[PDB]
Amino acid sequence: EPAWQTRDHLDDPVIGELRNRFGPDAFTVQATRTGVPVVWIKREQLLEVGDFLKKLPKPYVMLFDLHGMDERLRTHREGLPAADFSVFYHLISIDRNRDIMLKVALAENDLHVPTFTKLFPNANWYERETWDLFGITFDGHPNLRRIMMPQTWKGHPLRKDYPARATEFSPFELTKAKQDLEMEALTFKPEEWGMKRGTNEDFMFLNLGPNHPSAHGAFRIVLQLDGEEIVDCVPDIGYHHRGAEKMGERQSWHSYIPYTDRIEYLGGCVNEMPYVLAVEKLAGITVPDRVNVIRVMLSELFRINSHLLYISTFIQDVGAMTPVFFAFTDRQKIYDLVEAITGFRMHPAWFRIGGVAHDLPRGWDRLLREFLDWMPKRLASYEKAALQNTILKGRSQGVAAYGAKEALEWGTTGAGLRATGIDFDVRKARPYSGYENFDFEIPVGGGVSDCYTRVMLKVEELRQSLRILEQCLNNMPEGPFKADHPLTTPPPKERTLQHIETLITHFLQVSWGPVMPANESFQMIEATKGINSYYLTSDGSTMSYRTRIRTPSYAHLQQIPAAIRGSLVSDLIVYLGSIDFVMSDVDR
Amino acid sequence: DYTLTREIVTDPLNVFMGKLNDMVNWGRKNSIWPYNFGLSCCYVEMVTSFTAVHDVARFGAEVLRASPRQADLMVVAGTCFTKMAPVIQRLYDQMLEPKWVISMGACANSGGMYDIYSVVQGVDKFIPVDVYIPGCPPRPEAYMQALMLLQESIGKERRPLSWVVGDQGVYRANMQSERERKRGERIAVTNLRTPDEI
Amino acid sequence: ATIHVDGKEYEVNGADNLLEACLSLGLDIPYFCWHPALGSVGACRQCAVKQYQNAEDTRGRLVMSCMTPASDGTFISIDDEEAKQFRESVVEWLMTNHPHDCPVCEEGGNCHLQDMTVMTGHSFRRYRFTKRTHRNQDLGPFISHEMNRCIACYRCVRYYKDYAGGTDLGVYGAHDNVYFGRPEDGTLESEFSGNLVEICPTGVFTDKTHSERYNRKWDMQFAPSIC
Amino acid sequence: MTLKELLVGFGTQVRSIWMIGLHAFAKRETRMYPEEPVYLPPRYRGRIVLTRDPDGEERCVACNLCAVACPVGCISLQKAETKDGRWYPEFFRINFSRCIFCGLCEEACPTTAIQLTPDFEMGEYKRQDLVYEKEDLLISGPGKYPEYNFYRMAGMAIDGKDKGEAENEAKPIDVKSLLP
Ligand SMILES: CCCCCCCCCCCCCCCCCC(=O)OC[C@H](COP(=O)(O)OCCN)OC(=O)CCCCCCCCCCCCCCCCC
Ligand SMILES: CCCCCCCCCCC1=C(C)C(=O)C(OC)=C(OC)C1=O
Ligand code: SF4
Ligand code: SF4
Ligand code: SF4
Ligand code: SF4
Ligand code: SF4
Ligand code: FES
Fold it and tell me: Most buried among A532, B73, D53, D101, using CB within 10 Å?
């Protein structure tokens, strides 16, 4: 049985536990290609089911995702409850190495769900986004305001009747929004943002955006300050919302890949990987081994690129301005190899459904060998020049510390989670793309997630990626760069150029789009900044019915006030530099 | 051929006034201080151009002010999100004359691939642009090429030397388009390297 | 009538054949020579399904769904492995002589043969020999003729002669040199010859008036209107 | 703070200063654009051109696959036909202010007409001049694919290539022929 097969996951022990606790008729099990048990729960039992999963012997400790779906246009809903809308909850148990997707069906008039914030605190931002983009009200939410769109926005963009395209530009609306920008400092009410005690007669207020001179993007944080101490802070995000999920409903399966590139724009092929793996699950495609090794190589090259930028920008944020120049020289070496292979630097868009766009060009191994000889001495020089500096250590050690429980309750993934000692990397826990055939270690911390501990964990991850790249260079399989599946989009180009059936397949795949049969698929990967995931719903068409992108930077930015409360503002700058986020990842 | 702002007019250019205008234009085009403004991935390529492998400091364009008052150039390097558009307009209004604008990337040019509900379709809907860079992202040397194009445009514009004497109108050169300039050498291309090599 | 397709029970009209009954249920069976207005002839052999005699039957038999009545208590399989292989083989046989013409063919993106080639999952060519070719005819100002693209499904002659009552279109020749057209060059005399551009599943008969200012189907702006 | 911490920190600062000074004694990593030309690999995704077949005719058959495969929708063209019957673009315009240089059009092209070439220098003063018509795209040679010709594969008859003269084609047999 292939890994992309449609399964009900009725052999999962959590299904038997839920049946024993709530009864056989309390929920409906849906067969999907997501790889997780999908359980439709009644709305009135959602909090009970969440509590029961939270108090299991090996409990589901992390709310991985929470969002909505407009089911009104979905034609193939066989084996599903009646629903105009739905809300899904992706929960992960690390002790079981398992996950479950609960689903709540909602009528069109009765669009309200009980809030999940009393069980998982990251449900705050997730439910705010679900309210913003779908109009689903969450009862008991402390502040259910819009988080992507501005507060004076009409309609909910991810609804199926909302038009996706840009509206006509009006200078009057721009002038009005400028007037609100200038009057925001005067009409600031410290209760809409979820704060209390809005001036103890000494709590000043500070704004740190929305013009941020840094590579992570521009976003506002309004700070409540007692002298230099941060009493409270809420982040204002959505200034970089591109409507990428809505565009997922507006592009074919093949023509959406460049949009997957621009989610986490320092990631490139790492961003392409979960999307093409989930589409291949929908298509029933098993890629050959050479495709797996090529995609792993490009993912690790881009992981080293992103880690180099992250370490250099953190060192710059501490105050040492020199290593960023050399780190960008190393990034140029990586870009030489990536330009040679894919023809592009930052958004290669090179992965394909069923493989990659081209074969590896002749002579790529020379460039990879040159970079592998170049990198380690530069990395050691960066360590000795800046990362072992005691001024940098004093700026970074102990700043914005949290433990395993705080990382779990906020959905923190990546180096921030592993610095708490929790060994959870997707490349080992839930292997994908042939990562089992590589010998590499997963660095973990002692139990505390400082800025310095996160940075050193990312340095060790860079070294492990260099080891993976060395194994990629030494052991390259000889074979095809595209699968032999009929849904491989596009087909191999030479057969398109001389064979009529291949030409027909190419003609229909690039124009109308490849037809994915109606199913749901899910792929979770270890991205450069944490766990990235694509949840794709196909209604049987050439376009995605629903493209849900879970990004780790959203969770880390939401974790910020629980970790920085009671610190200084310079500590906030260092914490922002050590999170490893980009705002396109947050808003997307 | 010039464009007046206070009209398609002619060249207004004593021989000492022309030399003074040339000296002012030389000093302005050889000292261009960009505003440190990050919108999206195009900003990553711009600051890549600021690093050691490209060294945009060689053109005297590295100072990278965090204040709009001290900056002479605004590079819109990224998508003009509707929530960021009043911020962009306010930062442009806080800049002082003379000021120039470079749209970097398809998003800043026209909206790019993001013809979407939350994106303004190009920054020239609301602020005037001097140089456009196609690309997604443009490579760092494309940004340096646009910087040289801006230097060429600055080098033969006419602005008042003082605000108390003379014409206060700003004359901008109507350049020949780069497409029509490079058409002769671009169409003559016959063979390129095959994409199977490095 | 009650039929069982792939283990699922359906209620259908017993006067229908299996192909139109299954297409009315939303099932996808590839077909060429059948049309709803023309009836069934069993020529193209594309609509093969596996019919079983009873519910407890493993062997079955490949039958034409367009020629098989949807009688009560029928048992068939569309997604049977042998039936899928035969349908793919029929598409492959049609592709052996088909010209490399989709970019310069007015049927591209609106082609039934393209859709059924993709639907059967046939994208790999192992035929290496020559392809037969044909000269074209001048059919007048409305219909453009391109006999290379013909798959010999006989829908043009059936519509034009049996349905439309036309006399100047026919099938000529023999085994694999079957030619569909007029006995000589000239304008098609039927007042309903224009329906050939939708009846023909390939790009043999095309709209010449559209072909002057041609664009693909996905590029059109359509509206429901009255002639 | 501790005296040992102060001494270790002072030695660490001295080490950092020493390494940056030795960096000053090193080789420059700068590629001197524009005097040093930028090396671009042969498949670099820069300026888009339309190419010609080895006989000298333009390769584009106006099949509109590149336009529909474009995720930005920045390609517009219209099919025209010569008297011999070969298809060609009557016009072909690309909005380079919108183009994201993703290469999907070149991937979708069944004739290898449209190609992305190693040329990044495309800066412009006015956004209207970033709309490239066919006179700004069609180049004098085959580009990256030096020998492929779609019209030697197609069954459609054009000038200098009748029915049965394409690759893997047999001569047409009349139904009036005497052979059984
Ligand atoms: C107000 C200021 C008060 C404080 C300063 C007072 C004046 C100076 C008094 C003497 C200072 C001695 C400092 C300690 C030297 C020996 C220990 C040492 O170098 O510690 C720093 C660091 C320790 O290594 P570590 O960080 O643990 O890394 C792992 C490596 N095993 O090791 C390293 O980083 C590697 C070795 C670095 C050695 C640096 C040079 C030490 C001697 C400096 C002499 C004076 C220099 C003057 C300026 C020279 C440059 C222009
Ligand atoms: C006109 C006199 C200039 C003196 C030096 C100015 C400050 C240093 C160079 C400018 C600069 C700043 C401020 C800077 O912050 C920075 O980091 C983002 C740079 O690297 C790209 C810089 O080049
Ligand atoms: S043009 Fe492309 S690279 Fe530049 S900001 Fe837009 S998506 Fe990013
Ligand atoms: S008839 Fe159909 S399959 Fe044949 S060339 Fe035309 S579009 Fe292609
Ligand atoms: S010309 Fe068209 S309708 Fe007639 S037999 Fe051939 S493919 Fe069928
Ligand atoms: S490179 Fe991409 S965005 Fe540009 S014209 Fe081609 S398909 Fe469109
Ligand atoms: S895909 Fe190629 S042949 Fe077809 S219209 Fe575009 S450039 Fe012309
Ligand atoms: S459709 Fe039944 S044989 Fe042709």
Answer: A532
Neighbours of D76 (CB within 10 A): 16
- Which of C97, C111, C133, C150 has the highest number of chain D CBs within 10 A, making it the mutation to test binding with D? C133
User: A406, A451 in Cβ contact below 8 A?
Assistant: no
Q: Which of A378, A389, A511 should we substitute to test contact with D (largest number of D Cβ atoms within 10 Å)?
A: A511
Closest CA to A224 of A233, A214, A235: A233
Range of the domain at D94: 23-153
Phi/psi for A544 (5° steps) reads: -70, 130
Chains B and C touch (3+ CB pairs under 8 A): no
| B12 burial via Cβ count (<10 Å: 0-12, 13-18, 19+) | middle
> Is residue A413 within 8 Å of residue A555, measured between CB atoms?
yes
CA distance A158 to A136: 11
- Hey, which of B64, B65, B72, B143 would you mutate to test ligand 2's pocket, going by the most ligand atoms within 8 Å of its Cβ? B64
Domains belonging to chain A, first-starting first, are 13-139 (3.30.460.80), 244-587 (1.10.645.10)
- For residue D28, give the CATH number of its domain: 3.30.70.3270
Instruction: From the CA of C117, give the closest atom in ligand 4.
Output: 3
Rounded to the nearest angstrom, the gap between the alpha carbon of residue A187 and the centroid of all alpha carbons in its chain is: 35
Q: For chain D, say whether B184 makes contact (Cβ under 8 Å).
A: no
- Token pair, residue C174, equals 């023999």
Nearest to A524 by CA among A50, A216, A98, A12: A98
Give D 50-79 residues with CB within 8 A of chain C.
61, 63-65, 67-68, 78-79
**Alpha-carbon dihedral angle through residues D17, D21, D23, D28, given to the nearest 10 degrees:** 140
Resolution, in Å, please? 2.5
Q: How far apart are CA A124 and CA D34, in angstroms?
A: 51
Strand runs (DSSP E) across C54-169, as ranges? Answer: 61-64, 74-77, 143-145
Determination technique for this PDB entry? cryo-EM
Contact status, residue A438 vs residue A471, Cβ threshold 8 Å: yes
Q: Any idea what the CATH number is for the domain that residue B159 is in?
A: 3.40.50.12280
Residue among B39, B90, B83 at smallest CA distance from A153: B83
